[PDB]
Design a protein around this motif. Structure first.
Motif, PDB file in Angstrom:
ATOM      1  N   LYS A 252       0.871  -1.221   0.000  1.00  0.00           N
ATOM      2  CA  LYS A 252       0.000   0.000   0.000  1.00  0.00           C
ATOM      3  C   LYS A 252       0.890   1.248   0.000  1.00  0.00           C
ATOM      4  O   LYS A 252       2.122   1.096   0.019  1.00  0.00           O
ATOM      5  CB  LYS A 252      -0.988   0.000   1.178  1.00  0.00           C
ATOM      6  CG  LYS A 252      -0.439  -0.402   2.543  1.00  0.00           C
ATOM      7  CD  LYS A 252      -1.388  -0.065   3.672  1.00  0.00           C
ATOM      8  CE  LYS A 252      -1.126  -0.869   4.927  1.00  0.00           C
ATOM      9  NZ  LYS A 252      -2.041  -0.477   6.025  1.00  0.00           N
TER      10      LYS A 252
ATOM     11  N   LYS B  28       1.884   4.769   1.964  1.00  0.00           N
ATOM     12  CA  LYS B  28       1.906   5.414   3.298  1.00  0.00           C
ATOM     13  C   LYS B  28       2.658   6.739   3.197  1.00  0.00           C
ATOM     14  O   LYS B  28       3.854   6.688   2.876  1.00  0.00           O
ATOM     15  CB  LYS B  28       2.618   4.500   4.295  1.00  0.00           C
ATOM     16  CG  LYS B  28       1.896   3.203   4.615  1.00  0.00           C
ATOM     17  CD  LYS B  28       0.510   3.402   5.138  1.00  0.00           C
ATOM     18  CE  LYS B  28       0.131   2.393   6.197  1.00  0.00           C
ATOM     19  NZ  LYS B  28      -1.207   2.695   6.752  1.00  0.00           N
ATOM     20  N   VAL B  29       1.994   7.861   3.472  1.00  0.00           N
ATOM     21  CA  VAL B  29       2.606   9.217   3.385  1.00  0.00           C
ATOM     22  C   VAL B  29       3.157   9.579   4.766  1.00  0.00           C
ATOM     23  O   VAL B  29       2.377   9.296   5.647  1.00  0.00           O
ATOM     24  CB  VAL B  29       1.591  10.272   2.898  1.00  0.00           C
ATOM     25  CG1 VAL B  29       2.288  11.538   2.413  1.00  0.00           C
ATOM     26  CG2 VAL B  29       0.670   9.722   1.816  1.00  0.00           C
TER      27      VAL B  29
ATOM     28  N   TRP C 115       5.060  12.183   7.398  1.00  0.00           N
ATOM     29  CA  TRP C 115       5.482  13.613   7.556  1.00  0.00           C
ATOM     30  C   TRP C 115       6.601  13.698   8.595  1.00  0.00           C
ATOM     31  O   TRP C 115       6.636  12.886   9.506  1.00  0.00           O
ATOM     32  CB  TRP C 115       4.296  14.460   8.008  1.00  0.00           C
ATOM     33  CG  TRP C 115       3.364  14.740   6.878  1.00  0.00           C
ATOM     34  CD1 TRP C 115       2.286  13.997   6.507  1.00  0.00           C
ATOM     35  CD2 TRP C 115       3.472  15.805   5.919  1.00  0.00           C
ATOM     36  NE1 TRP C 115       1.690  14.552   5.405  1.00  0.00           N
ATOM     37  CE2 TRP C 115       2.398  15.653   5.014  1.00  0.00           C
ATOM     38  CE3 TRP C 115       4.352  16.881   5.744  1.00  0.00           C
ATOM     39  CZ2 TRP C 115       2.175  16.537   3.962  1.00  0.00           C
ATOM     40  CZ3 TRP C 115       4.143  17.747   4.692  1.00  0.00           C
ATOM     41  CH2 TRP C 115       3.068  17.575   3.817  1.00  0.00           C
TER      42      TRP C 115
ATOM     43  N   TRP D 250       7.995  15.545   3.429  1.00  0.00           N
ATOM     44  CA  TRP D 250       7.070  14.449   3.118  1.00  0.00           C
ATOM     45  C   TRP D 250       7.823  13.476   2.206  1.00  0.00           C
ATOM     46  O   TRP D 250       8.545  13.940   1.304  1.00  0.00           O
ATOM     47  CB  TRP D 250       5.730  14.941   2.540  1.00  0.00           C
ATOM     48  CG  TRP D 250       5.726  15.307   1.087  1.00  0.00           C
ATOM     49  CD1 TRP D 250       5.731  16.568   0.571  1.00  0.00           C
ATOM     50  CD2 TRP D 250       5.666  14.419  -0.046  1.00  0.00           C
ATOM     51  NE1 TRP D 250       5.707  16.526  -0.797  1.00  0.00           N
ATOM     52  CE2 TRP D 250       5.671  15.226  -1.206  1.00  0.00           C
ATOM     53  CE3 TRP D 250       5.629  13.030  -0.204  1.00  0.00           C
ATOM     54  CZ2 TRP D 250       5.646  14.699  -2.494  1.00  0.00           C
ATOM     55  CZ3 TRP D 250       5.607  12.509  -1.479  1.00  0.00           C
ATOM     56  CH2 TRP D 250       5.614  13.332  -2.607  1.00  0.00           C
ATOM     57  N   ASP D 251       7.745  12.182   2.506  1.00  0.00           N
ATOM     58  CA  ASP D 251       8.150  11.099   1.575  1.00  0.00           C
ATOM     59  C   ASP D 251       7.044  10.052   1.611  1.00  0.00           C
ATOM     60  O   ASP D 251       6.580   9.746   2.714  1.00  0.00           O
ATOM     61  CB  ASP D 251       9.552  10.567   1.898  1.00  0.00           C
ATOM     62  CG  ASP D 251       9.866  10.350   3.371  1.00  0.00           C
ATOM     63  OD1 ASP D 251       9.167  10.934   4.227  1.00  0.00           O
ATOM     64  OD2 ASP D 251      10.819   9.598   3.654  1.00  0.00           O
ATOM     65  N   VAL D 252       6.591   9.593   0.441  1.00  0.00           N
ATOM     66  CA  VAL D 252       5.679   8.415   0.296  1.00  0.00           C
ATOM     67  C   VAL D 252       6.542   7.147   0.252  1.00  0.00           C
ATOM     68  O   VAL D 252       7.514   7.126  -0.526  1.00  0.00           O
ATOM     69  CB  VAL D 252       4.762   8.536  -0.941  1.00  0.00           C
ATOM     70  CG1 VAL D 252       4.016   7.243  -1.219  1.00  0.00           C
ATOM     71  CG2 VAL D 252       3.767   9.678  -0.794  1.00  0.00           C
ATOM     72  N   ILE D 253       6.211   6.145   1.075  1.00  0.00           N
ATOM     73  CA  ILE D 253       6.825   4.782   1.043  1.00  0.00           C
ATOM     74  C   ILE D 253       5.807   3.835   0.388  1.00  0.00           C
ATOM     75  O   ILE D 253       4.643   3.863   0.822  1.00  0.00           O
ATOM     76  CB  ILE D 253       7.258   4.333   2.462  1.00  0.00           C
ATOM     77  CG1 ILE D 253       8.324   5.257   3.070  1.00  0.00           C
ATOM     78  CG2 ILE D 253       7.723   2.884   2.473  1.00  0.00           C
ATOM     79  CD1 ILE D 253       9.755   5.001   2.613  1.00  0.00           C
ATOM     80  N   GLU D 254       6.206   3.089  -0.657  1.00  0.00           N
ATOM     81  CA  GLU D 254       5.415   1.946  -1.207  1.00  0.00           C
ATOM     82  C   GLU D 254       5.593   0.742  -0.273  1.00  0.00           C
ATOM     83  O   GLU D 254       6.670   0.110  -0.270  1.00  0.00           O
ATOM     84  CB  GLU D 254       5.763   1.578  -2.655  1.00  0.00           C
ATOM     85  CG  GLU D 254       4.871   0.460  -3.206  1.00  0.00           C
ATOM     86  CD  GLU D 254       4.513   0.503  -4.689  1.00  0.00           C
ATOM     87  OE1 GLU D 254       5.401   0.847  -5.499  1.00  0.00           O
ATOM     88  OE2 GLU D 254       3.343   0.177  -5.035  1.00  0.00           O
ATOM     89  N   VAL D 255       4.527   0.443   0.468  1.00  0.00           N
ATOM     90  CA  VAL D 255       4.505  -0.438   1.670  1.00  0.00           C
ATOM     91  C   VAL D 255       3.948  -1.806   1.244  1.00  0.00           C
ATOM     92  O   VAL D 255       4.658  -2.588   0.588  1.00  0.00           O
ATOM     93  CB  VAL D 255       3.688   0.251   2.787  1.00  0.00           C
ATOM     94  CG1 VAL D 255       3.334  -0.675   3.939  1.00  0.00           C
ATOM     95  CG2 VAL D 255       4.408   1.490   3.306  1.00  0.00           C
TER      96      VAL D 255
ATOM     97  N   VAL E  41      11.744  15.822   0.301  1.00  0.00           N
ATOM     98  CA  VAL E  41      11.123  17.031  -0.310  1.00  0.00           C
ATOM     99  C   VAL E  41      10.646  17.944   0.823  1.00  0.00           C
ATOM    100  O   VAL E  41      10.083  17.318   1.694  1.00  0.00           O
ATOM    101  CB  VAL E  41       9.959  16.663  -1.253  1.00  0.00           C
ATOM    102  CG1 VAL E  41       9.602  17.817  -2.181  1.00  0.00           C
ATOM    103  CG2 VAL E  41      10.254  15.402  -2.058  1.00  0.00           C
TER     104      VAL E  41
ATOM    105  N   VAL F 159       4.757   4.249  -7.796  1.00  0.00           N
ATOM    106  CA  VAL F 159       3.955   5.256  -7.033  1.00  0.00           C
ATOM    107  C   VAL F 159       4.006   6.598  -7.772  1.00  0.00           C
ATOM    108  O   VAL F 159       5.112   7.152  -7.923  1.00  0.00           O
ATOM    109  CB  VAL F 159       4.479   5.396  -5.593  1.00  0.00           C
ATOM    110  CG1 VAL F 159       4.277   6.793  -5.031  1.00  0.00           C
ATOM    111  CG2 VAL F 159       3.853   4.354  -4.683  1.00  0.00           C
TER     112      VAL F 159
END
Lengths: 11, 11, 11, 11, 11, 11, 11, 11, 11, 11, 11, 11
Positions: free
Chosen positions: A1, A3-4, A6, B6-11, C4, H2
């Protein structure tokens, strides 16, 4: 999934 | 200073 | 890694 | 005014 | 340093 | 309309 | 008004 | 992968 | 000042 | 199609 | 519709 | 290095 995550890094 | 990050992780 | 960072500077 | 800013840091 | 500023001006 | 704008500032 | 919408679409 | 997406809506 | 405006017009 | 456009405004 | 996708690829 | 990328998808 997707997950963002911060953070507030103090410098 | 204060840096907000902010960084998005593909989980 | 890649981080970022966002800011809203009031002027 | 209000200025919104982005910089990527290679961490 | 280099700071990239974005804006959406409504007209 | 809606105009999206970018300017780089040498900071 | 102007509303900036974000999305992370997983593919 | 992503994909991170932005669209402005004139509201 | 100089403001560079971008658009994506769908046709 | 999709057309990407740039115009500079002297502001 | 038109969706603008951003990426920061680390190399 | 760090490469920042944009592609528009006709959705």
């Amino acid at each position: 999934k997707v997950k963002v995550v911060w953070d507030v890094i103090e410098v």
